Amino acid sequence: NPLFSPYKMGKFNLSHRVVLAPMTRCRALNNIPQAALGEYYEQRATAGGFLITEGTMISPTSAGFPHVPGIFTKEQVREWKKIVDVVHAKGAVIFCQLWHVGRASHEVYQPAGAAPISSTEKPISNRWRILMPDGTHGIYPKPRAIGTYEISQVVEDYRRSALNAIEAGFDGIEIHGAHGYLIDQFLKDGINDRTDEYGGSLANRCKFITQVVQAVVSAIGADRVGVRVSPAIDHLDAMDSNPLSLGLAVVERLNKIQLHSGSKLAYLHVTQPRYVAYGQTEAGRLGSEEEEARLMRTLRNAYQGTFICSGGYTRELGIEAVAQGDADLVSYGRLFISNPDLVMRIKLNAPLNKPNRKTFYTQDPVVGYTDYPFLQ
Amino acid sequence: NPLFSPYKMGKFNLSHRVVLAPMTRCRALNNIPQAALGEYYEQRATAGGFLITEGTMISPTSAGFPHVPGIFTKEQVREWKKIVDVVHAKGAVIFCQLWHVGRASHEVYQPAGAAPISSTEKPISNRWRILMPDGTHGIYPKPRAIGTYEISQVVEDYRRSALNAIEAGFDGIEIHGAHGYLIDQFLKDGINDRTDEYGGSLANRCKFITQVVQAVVSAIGADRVGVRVSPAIDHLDAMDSNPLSLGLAVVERLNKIQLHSGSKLAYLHVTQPRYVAYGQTEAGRLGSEEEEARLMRTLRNAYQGTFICSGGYTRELGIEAVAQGDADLVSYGRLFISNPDLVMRIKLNAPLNKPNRKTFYTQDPVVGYTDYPFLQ
Ligand SMILES: Cc1cc2nc3c(=O)[nH]c(=O)nc-3n(C[C@H](O)[C@H](O)[C@H](O)COP(=O)(O)O)c2cc1C
Ligand SMILES: Cc1cc2nc3c(=O)[nH]c(=O)nc-3n(C[C@H](O)[C@H](O)[C@H](O)COP(=O)(O)O)c2cc1C
């Protein structure tokens, strides 16, 4: 089983290739990590296994979901340390994902009633909604296109949060640069309509992620930094005219940060598009799944380092990704929600619990969170 | 179950509201309807049920898929008659969809390797592919822009094909005016860059569809003519700057044809964009379809007659569409591919077979065509 062949990720001797993908679950009441998160991550931790935490706030204004943890206050750092300790007790490696949602926010998640920040003034279109604290779905407001001088302040929020993650004992951080959130709002030319130095050419649109990555690398070292992107994705109106061109520009700048830093990053983490659009048309799907495979393998061959693939993976698709050399590590999300011992189950090819979508984002510290059964 | 309320479509007393949507399947080898088509439509026919055939060529220049049937020769009429006879023997109503692909073709599909015809010289871009006869995907080429006299010849091709369909025994015809094919290449201001009386204003862009519909109405009668459009679907680079305005402008012209002809069309058939809610993303399952639903309801409210909705419909969505008054009839494509007895399965709320996209457009007369199983 290729998934259980060991993998060296930097200084990390991983015993298997099954990774816990970062997943928002909204159990961090009032944005402070809770003991429930400890039991949750403890359940999924394995000897030599890699975990990535839920997206975590870098500033008071950076959230777009309820009860997501932060790591911008000293109190949050203190509570994360307790979670990290129990994961390390089980011998696992754990990175904290740093998450700014940008224009994907709401007045209820904005402490000063300010408009959410972004590259653009364009709002998320009406077919997307936000989760409200009462469980209802809300409308995304109009964001504010931030000026040049404001870029550095947000970059600084990543740096201070990265230092805070290290203070809490995390083995590293992951930059959430995917899925139409703040960093992806600069990357994608379907969102980024700016005319200043952060807009226009591929090089200009890549400046924000480059400056974010360089700041956290200069703060905690390249070996403790992973980066997540999704060049091709249908999420929150993030589309690009040439996803392949965009992906290789990001890879080329990441490769260059490694060259000048003299150390590789922890990894590149890329979401599988899993294109299913225009399925009701005559020609909309012709050659789509072939374009998608080419996208991923082209990025993988170009990136000089560890490659993690994510999105719609199953036990069979994960085996084949590693077997064909398509990725070094495979992260699982939904199956890891409902199977605390997904790693063991994948080893044994056991039956897999089915996830209950209804409790993905509810606030109960147990129900839908820690009461999915182990193998008996 | 509102889908099994009877519906009166003109003279036709339909016993239920589940419609077979028109679907290209490429089993009509060398453009001649085959016996396999008779078995396929017979499997799906029900007493009082309405069927619409796959897109059918109106001329040697109208195809952009391999082995699609024509109805522009007498040999084709004779073979279609056998299929119509077995469908009528089961008590179903059947219309033949008349299809010209315009610029969505390739030299391999054109007489003497000629360029495809269109409103414009602009090609479909390389984000779309054409299916080639050998099963690979090819590149759409530059079309030739036709002038006023040749437009009138294409209109006559529609008229002659409509007469041929009646000669074969069809209950009527459907004009394929959707999905970025020839008529939509005149409708959509993202495609139509003409400056003559067929380009520019909404009125000019609607001239071609009005001419086509008027010509067939005057040949066989409005009661035997249905019209299909998709103002909000941008398949094959067919975008309009104001889809709802374009949709209402088309509806206006159809209402006017009906008043001047003194009788209603069989129906207006509209395919709507349908956005798959991705489960792998943070907010994919929080989406809203309200905006697309309001577009469809506004077109239906504006049109004086029978409305067929299509695009991503399920059992539950079809029930809701009829129950809320949003449509009179609901057409199903992909689920009708894999469920020959889809009508009965929806009536009983039975499980549905999954369709296999790999055999949507292959040539076998059985495999992936007639060997999907009935309820047992
Ligand atoms: C409930 C849920 C929450 C998620 N939260 C995040 C997140 O906070 N940050 C992130 O980068 N991806 C997030 N994702 C995407 C996952 O990390 C992962 O890419 C996806 O679940 C993998 O596909 P799979 O569920 O088929 O395994 C989330 C996915 C789900 C289903
Ligand atoms: C394989 C396939 C072939 C199709 N061929 C045609 C066609 O020839 N003419 C047409 O107007 N629409 C065609 N369509 C679109 C369907 O008529 C219909 O609008 C769509 O399939 C409905 O969505 P559903 O599959 O979710 O039911 C086709 C769709 C598919 C999947």
Measured between CB atoms, does B276 come within 8 Å of chain A? Answer: yes
B283: Cβ contacts below 8 Å, ≥ 6 apart: A104, A128, A129, A130, A131, A235, A236
Nearest protein CA to atom 4 of ligand 2, as residue: B23
Q: Is A129 assigned a ligand-binding role in the annotation?
A: no
Distance of alpha carbon A209 from alpha carbon A155, whole angstroms: 9
A chain contacts of residue B65, beta-carbon cutoff 8 Å: 282
Integer-rounded Cα Rg, in Å, for chain A is: 19
The ranges assigned to domains in chain A are: 2-359
**Dihedral sign computed on CA atoms, order B209, B215, B221, B225:** negative
Distance of alpha carbon B18 from alpha carbon A178, whole angstroms: 41
- Single out the residue of A133, A234, A238 nearest to residue A185, CA to CA: A238
- Single out the residue of A256, A190, A198, A272 nearest to residue A222, CA to CA: A256
Partner-chain contact A280 B271, CB within 8 Å: yes
CATH classification code of A2-359: 3.20.20.70
Q: Is A127 assigned a ligand-binding role in the annotation?
A: no
| b/e burial code for range A284-322 (CB count within 10 A of at least 16 → b) | bbbbbeebbeebbeebbebbebbbbbbbbbebeebbebb
- DSSP-derived 3-state class of residue B92: coil
> A273 in ligand 1 pocket by Cβ < 6 Å?
no
Angle subtended by helix axes A148-167 and A207-220, to nearest 10: 30
Angle subtended by helix axes B74-89 and B35-44, to nearest 10: 30
* One-letter identity of residue A342: L
Distance of alpha carbon B225 from alpha carbon A23, whole angstroms: 52
Among the bound ligands, the one closest to the CA of A286:
2
Structure-token pair, residue B35: 């016996």
- Angstrom CA distances, A131 to A38, A102, B116, B236, B361, stand at 24, 15, 48, 34, 41
**Residue A95: beta bridge partners?**
A52, A172
CA atoms within 13 A on the CB side of B276: 14
Place of tokens 């009166």: B8
* Closest Cβ opposite residue B128 in set A127, A129, A283: A283
Ligand 2 atom nearest B178 alpha carbon: 11
**Resolution in angstrom units:** 1.7
Q: Would you give the DSSP letter of residue B70? A: B
Structure-token pair, residue B319: 């029930």
Measured between CB atoms, does A275 come within 8 Å of chain B? Answer: no
Distance of alpha carbon B326 from alpha carbon B309, whole angstroms: 8
Burial of A219 (0-12, 13-18, 19+ CB in 10 A): middle
Give the residue from A179, A241, A281, A359 with the most B CB atoms within 10 Å of its CB, the best one to mutate.
Answer: A281
- Number of neighbouring beta carbons within 10 Å of residue B285: 15
- Single out the residue of B189, B158, B193 nearest to residue B176, CA to CA: B158
Measured between CB atoms, does A295 come within 8 Å of chain B? Answer: no
- Number of neighbouring beta carbons within 10 Å of residue B42: 18
Distance of alpha carbon B217 from alpha carbon B355, whole angstroms: 36
**Dihedral sign computed on CA atoms, order B218, B223, B224, B225:** positive
Distance of alpha carbon B376 from alpha carbon B356, whole angstroms: 20
Distance of alpha carbon B57 from alpha carbon B71, whole angstroms: 6
Give the residue from B54, B281, B332 with the most A CB atoms within 10 Å of its CB, the best one to mutate.
Answer: B281
Q: Would you give the DSSP letter of residue A268? A: E
Spatial contact of A312 and A272, defined as CB atoms under 8 Å apart: yes
The CATH homologous superfamily of the domain defined by B2-276+286-359: Aldolase class I (3.20.20.70)
Spatial contact of A189 and A140, defined as CB atoms under 8 Å apart: no
Q: Is A7 known to be catalytic?
A: no
Q: Is B23 assigned a ligand-binding role in the annotation?
A: yes
Q: Which of residues 101-120 of B touch A (CB under 8 A)?
A: 104
| b/e burial code for range A111-150 (CB count within 10 A of at least 16 → b) | eeeebbbbbbebbbeebbbbbbeeeeebebbebebbeeee
